[PDB]
């Protein structure tokens, strides 16, 4: 229950972490747990390094998505104005 939290809490969000540097926390020598993490995370597996791409991640904007609830909140807000009235 700690080891899966290494994988969960390392990213997001770190730009990159070197290979042997993460091997210092996973212990062992060249475990298959980091291969299973190369599956579970996905995420990326790079040569002698690792990457959070892409990018950091999913890039929320959120553009016009929050404009719907921004209109929606004002709907019931105006309703509270009409309840006074």
């Amino acid at each position: 229950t700690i080891r899966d939290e290494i994988a969960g809490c390392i990213e997001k969000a770190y730009e990159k972490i070197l290979f042997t540097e993460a091997t210092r926390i996973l212990f062992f020598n060249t475990p298959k747990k980091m291969t299973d993490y190369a599956k579970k995370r996905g995420w990326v597996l790079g040569p002698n390094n690792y990457y959070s791409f892409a990018s950091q991640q999913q890039k929320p904007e959120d553009t016009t998505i929050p404009s719907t609830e921004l209109a929606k909140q004002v709907i019931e807000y105006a309703r509270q104005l009409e309840m006074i009235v």
């Binding site: 016009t64 404009s67 719907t68 921004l70 209109a71 004002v74 709907i75 807000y77 105006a78 104005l81």
Partner: protein, 155 residues
């Protein structure tokens, strides 16, 4: 409004001039009396009742014609023109409301102190009193017509 009259016979002045039957409408018509000139016609003349009839179909449309007159043709035109207004010079119209709220309130903040001088609500008035109701109603019109922005401009 309007009115209605009827000529009583002047040659009947020897006989009884005092009908009618079903005096209800007579009682409501002669009222209020209502000055003098009106009463000067009780002799030689008598009024006659008026009541509207419907004809409620055309009356229904006749209501909606004047009411819809204030509404727009497409209904998205003048409301979106009030959305063009929603930022004008509306920030400047809200500066108009801001000056009414400073100027009326710093003189309406002396009124709770003056109530202790006169003790308490004896005449009076000043005024310079209240008027914030109209300010809140105009600001509420501003915020609602402005809340239409997120509905209209978006989709």
């Amino acid at each position: 409004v309007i009115d209605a009259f009827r000529l009583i016979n002047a040659n009947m002045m020897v006989l009884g001039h005092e009908p009618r039957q079903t005096t209800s409408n007579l009682g409501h018509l002669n009222k209020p009396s209502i000055q003098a000139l009106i009463h000067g016609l009780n002799r030689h003349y008598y009024s006659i009742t008026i009541n509207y009839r419907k004809n409620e179909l055309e009356q229904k449309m006749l209501l909606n014609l004047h009411k819809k007159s204030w509404m727009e043709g497409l209904t998205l035109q003048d409301y979106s023109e009030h959305c063009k207004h929603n930022e004008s010079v509306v920030k400047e119209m809200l500066e108009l409301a801001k000056n009414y709220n400073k100027a009326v309130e710093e003189e309406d903040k002396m009124t709770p102190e003056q109530l202790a001088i006169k003790n308490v609500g004896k005449q009076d008035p000043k005024r310079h009193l209240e008027e914030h109701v109209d300010v809140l109603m105009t600001s509420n019109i501003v915020q609602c017509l402005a809340a239409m922005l997120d509905t209209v401009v978006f989709k």
